Design an enzyme around this catalytic site. Structure first.
Site, PDB file in Angstrom:
ATOM      1  CG  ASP A   8      33.572 -17.951  38.690  1.00 22.43           C
ATOM      2  OD1 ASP A   8      33.844 -18.282  39.873  1.00 22.43           O
ATOM      3  OD2 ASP A   8      33.590 -18.784  37.746  1.00 22.43           O
ATOM      4  CE  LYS A  70      34.896 -20.667  45.606  1.00 23.98           C
ATOM      5  NZ  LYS A  70      34.378 -20.508  44.229  1.00 23.98           N
ATOM      6  CD  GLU A 171      31.154 -20.927  42.768  1.00 22.88           C
ATOM      7  OE1 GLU A 171      31.366 -22.134  42.502  1.00 22.88           O
ATOM      8  OE2 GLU A 171      31.912 -20.259  43.496  1.00 22.88           O
ATOM      9  CG  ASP A 193      31.368 -25.958  38.622  1.00 18.43           C
ATOM     10  OD1 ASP A 193      32.455 -26.012  38.009  1.00 18.43           O
ATOM     11  OD2 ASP A 193      30.978 -24.907  39.165  1.00 18.43           O
TER      12      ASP A 193
HETATM   13 MG   LIG Z   1      34.312 -24.281  37.590  1.00 21.84          MG
END
Ligand SMILES: [Mg+2]
Ligand SMILES: C#CCNc1ncnc2c1ncn2[C@H]1O[C@H](COP(=O)(O)OP(=O)(O)O)[C@@H](O)[C@H]1O
Length: 379
Positions: A8, A70, A171, A193
Site C-alpha cells: 500500500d 501521491k 485500494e 477510507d
Molecule cells: Mg487510508
C-alpha cells in the site's frame, strides 16, 4: 517462485505485507512499526531522510520535506489538483521539462515517481529483512480514481526501487479482498477510507467474484493530518490566552505541538480524556510549560466540520451508484482515522449499518495487495 510482496503506497503512510501460509503477514520496519510515513526530506547538507526520520522534522524543515506527493504522481503541472496542492503545501512544486508536475528542494528536481520510489525502497528493505532474499515481484495498490498516467507513474516508481510491478489494483478492491468478499455471489459494498491525507468513498458491486466499481467520490484534501492541524491551532490559541506567548513563529515548538496533537488525538480514540504536556515549550520572564487536559467531546467539537465533510461525498456516491442505504450489504472501514469513534458513528448514520472493523483498517489494503500477490504466485 519467489513470494510477491503487496505494498500500500499511501498518501500519508505506507504498509507492506506478504502471504505466509494461508494468511497475509504485515511486516514491521526496522523501527518496529507496521506502517511507514510516505515522507522524504533533504537536510541542509543534502542527506536524504525517509519515513519516521523525515516526518520528525517536517515542521522545522518545511521547504525541503516532501509529503502527500501521491497527489502529484502522474499529473500535469496544470492539473487543477496540482494547483490546489500548491496552495496547501509549502514545498516547491515545479513544471518539469515535459510539463509534468515535479518537486524541488535545494535546486534539485524530483519526479513524484522518484519520491514514491524512495518510500518503496524502504518498503522493500522491510520486506527483505523478513524474506531473507531480494524481493523481485510487487503488487502495488492505487486509488480507484487513478487514471492511466497515474497508474503508469506508480508502476515506474516500483521499477525505480527494483520491483517488477506484476499488477496494480484499486485500494477499495484490495480492502474487500482482506475481508474475504472475493467469493461473494451478489453483494454491494461501501468502502469508507479516511487516511492521513485523503478521504475516499467507493461503492463496489461483487457478482460471482467479479468486482465492479460503481461510483467514486471523496476529498483529496481531507485527512487525519487536518484533524491534527485543527487541534494544533486550538492549542496555540489557548496557549496565547493563558500565557500571552504566541507560538506560530516558533517552528521548533510547533513541531512538538504537532507531535502532541497527533498523540492526543489517538489516545482519545480509547479514552475520554488526555493530557497534553510539553515542558519548557518556550522560554518567554521565564520558562512556560504547556499543560492542557483535552476531552473527547472537546476534540470532537474542534474537528466537527472535518468529519461532516465526509457526509456529502458519501451521499453523492450512493446517488451515482443508483444505490440506497438498504441496498448496501456491508460497509468496510479503511484508514487510521476511522479508528475515531465519532467517525465510526458518522459512518453508521450514513449507511444505516454498523461498519465492519474485522480487519485492521491501517493494514487492510496492504493485506489485500498481498493476497492478490499470492494469487499471482499461484499459491
Ligand atoms: Mg487510508
Ligand atoms: C484506537 C485507536 C487510536 N488509533 C488512531 N486514532 C486516530 N488516528 C489514527 C490512529 N492510528 C493511526 N491513525 C492515523 O489515521 C491517519 C493515517 O491513516 P493512513 O490510512 O495510514 O494514511 P494514508 O492512507 O493517507 O496513507 C493519521 O492521521 C493517523 O492519526
Amino acid at each position: 517462485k519467489g513470494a510477491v510482496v503487496g505494498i500500500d503506497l499511501g498518501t500519508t503512510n505506507s504498509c507492506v505485507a506478504v502471504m505466509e501460509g494461508k494468511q497475509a503477514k504485515v511486516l514491521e520496519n526496522a523501527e518496529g512499526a507496521r506502517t511507514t510515513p510516505s515522507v522524504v526530506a533533504f537536510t541542509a547538507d543534502g542527506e536524504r531522510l525517509v519515513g519516521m526520520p523525515a516526518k520528525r522534522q517536517a515542521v522545522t524543515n518545511p521547504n525541503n520535506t516532501f509529503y502527500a506527493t501521491k497527489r502529484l504522481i502522474g499529473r500535469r503541472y496544470d492539473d487543477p489538483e496540482v494547483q490546489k496542492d500548491i496552495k496547501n503545501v509549502p514545498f516547491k512544486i515545479v513544471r518539469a521539462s515535459n510539463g509534468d508536475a515535479w518537486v524541488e528542494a535545494h535546486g534539485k528536481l524530483y519526479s513524484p515517481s522518484q519520491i514514491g520510489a524512495f518510500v518503496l525502497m524502504k518498503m522493500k528493505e522491510t520486506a527483505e529483512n523478513y524474506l531473507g532474499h531480494t524481493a523481485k515481484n510487487a503488487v502495488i495498490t492505487v486509488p480507484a480514481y487513478f487514471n492511466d498516467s497515474q497508474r503508469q507513474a506508480t508502476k515506474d516508481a516500483g521499477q525505480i526501487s527494483g520491483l517488477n510491478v506484476l499488477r496494480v489494483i484499486n485500494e477499495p478492491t484490495a480492502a474487500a479482498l482482506a475481508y474475504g468478499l472475493d467469493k461473494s455471489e451478489d453483494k454491494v459494498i461501501a468502502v469508507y477510507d479516511l487516511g492521513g491525507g485523503t478521504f475516499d468513498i467507493s461503492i463496489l458491486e461483487i457478482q460471482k467474484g467479479v468486482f465492479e466499481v460503481k461510483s467514486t467520490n471523496g476529498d483529496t484534501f481531507l485527512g487525519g493530518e487536518d484533524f491534527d492541524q485543527a487541534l494544533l491551532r486550538h492549542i496555540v490559541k489557548e496557549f496565547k490566552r493563558e500565557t500571552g506567548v504566541d507560538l506560530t513563529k516558533d517552528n521548533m515548538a510547533l513541531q512538538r505541538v504537532r507531535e502532541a496533537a497527533e498523540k492526543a488525538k489517538c489516545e482519545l480514540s480509547s479514552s475520554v480524556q488526555t493530557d497534553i504536556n510539553l515542558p519548557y515549550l518556550t522560554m518567554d520572564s521565564g520558562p512556560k510549560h504547556l499543560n492542557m487536559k483535552l476531552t473527547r467531546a472537546q476534540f470532537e467539537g474542534i474537528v466537527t466540520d472535518l468529519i461532516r465533510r465526509t457526509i456529502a461525498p458519501c451521499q453523492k456516491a450512493m446517488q451515482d451508484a443508483e444505490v440506497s442505504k438498504s441496498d448496501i450489504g456491508e460497509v468496510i472501514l479503511v484508514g487510521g482515522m476511522t479508528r475515531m469513534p465519532k467517525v465510526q458513528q458518522t459512518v453508521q448514520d450514513l449507511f444505516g449499518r454498523a461498519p465492519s472493523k474485522a480487519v485492521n483498517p491501517d493494514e487492510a489494503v496492504a493485506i489485500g495487495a498481498a493476497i492478490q500477490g499470492g494469487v499471482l504466485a499461484g499459491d
